[PDB]
Amino acid sequence: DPGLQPGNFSADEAGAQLFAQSYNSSAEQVLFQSVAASWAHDTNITAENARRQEEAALLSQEFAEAWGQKAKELYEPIWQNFTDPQLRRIIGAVRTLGSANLPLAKRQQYNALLSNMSR
Numbered sequence: 001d002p003g004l005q006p007g008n009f010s011a012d013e014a015g016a017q018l019f020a021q022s023y024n025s026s027a028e029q030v031l032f033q034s035v036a037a038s039w040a041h042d043t044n045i046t047a048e049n050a051r052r053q054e055e056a057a058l059l060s061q062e063f064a065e066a067w068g069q070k071a072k073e074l075y076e077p078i079w080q081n082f083t084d085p086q087l088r089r090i091i092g093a094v095r096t097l098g099s100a101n102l103p104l105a106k107r108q109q110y111n112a113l114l115s116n117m118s119r
């Protein structure tokens with residue numbers, strides 16, 4: 001999936017600018033499909049759309065996982081010094097991977113814990 005895989009960037013601030021300029025481009029399609037699935041679950045019948053919403057959430061999560069992982073791997077040492085609040089905040093938001101940092105078994109346990117809690 002081209003949306004799932006980010007591009008090739010450098011470690012400089014201009015590379016970070018290209019990074020943050022492609023992030024919105026991917027976010028357009030992925031967030032659009034996510035909001036469309038949520039709308040279908042909400043504005044229409046709840047049946048035959050819950051699995052659509054679930055798969056949309058899964059693909060959005062994979063998008064964020066890959067893009068944030070690349071963000072961290074490239075700009076962990078230079079995340080602080082950027083001399084511009086906009087891209088600094090963009091990199092700060094993308095860097096935070098949430099629960100994605102956990103290994104496979106730990107992440108599965110965490111998600112199943114959340115599901116059991118809500119249920």
Ligand SMILES: *[C@@H]1O[C@H](CO[C@@H]2O[C@@H](C)[C@@H](O)[C@@H](O)[C@@H]2O)[C@@H](O[C@@H]2O[C@H](CO)[C@@H](O[C@@H]3O[C@H](CO)[C@@H](O)[C@H](O)[C@@H]3O)[C@H](O)[C@H]2NC(C)=O)[C@H](O)[C@H]1NC(C)=O
Pocket residue numbers: 108109110112113116
């Ligand atoms: C909570 O979730 C479990 C599944 O477990 C999930 O993964 C774990 C690694 C933890 O992170 C959990 O928090 C996480 O939710 C639901 O599945 C239930 O699991 C049990 C244990 O495996 C199943 O077997 C039971 O085991 C013993 C005997 O071996 C007896 O208690 C029962 O007779 C039963 O066999 C159980 O069938 C299974 N239930 C399902 C699949 O419906 C669990 O329902 C859910 N809620 C609670 C209250 O635990």
Ligand SMILES: *[C@@H]1O[C@H](CO)[C@@H](O)[C@H](O)[C@H]1NC(C)=O
Pocket residue numbers: 007008009
């Ligand atoms: C960017 O770097 C990655 C590092 O694995 C490499 O695989 C990829 O081909 C590079 N992209 C381009 C367009 O050269």
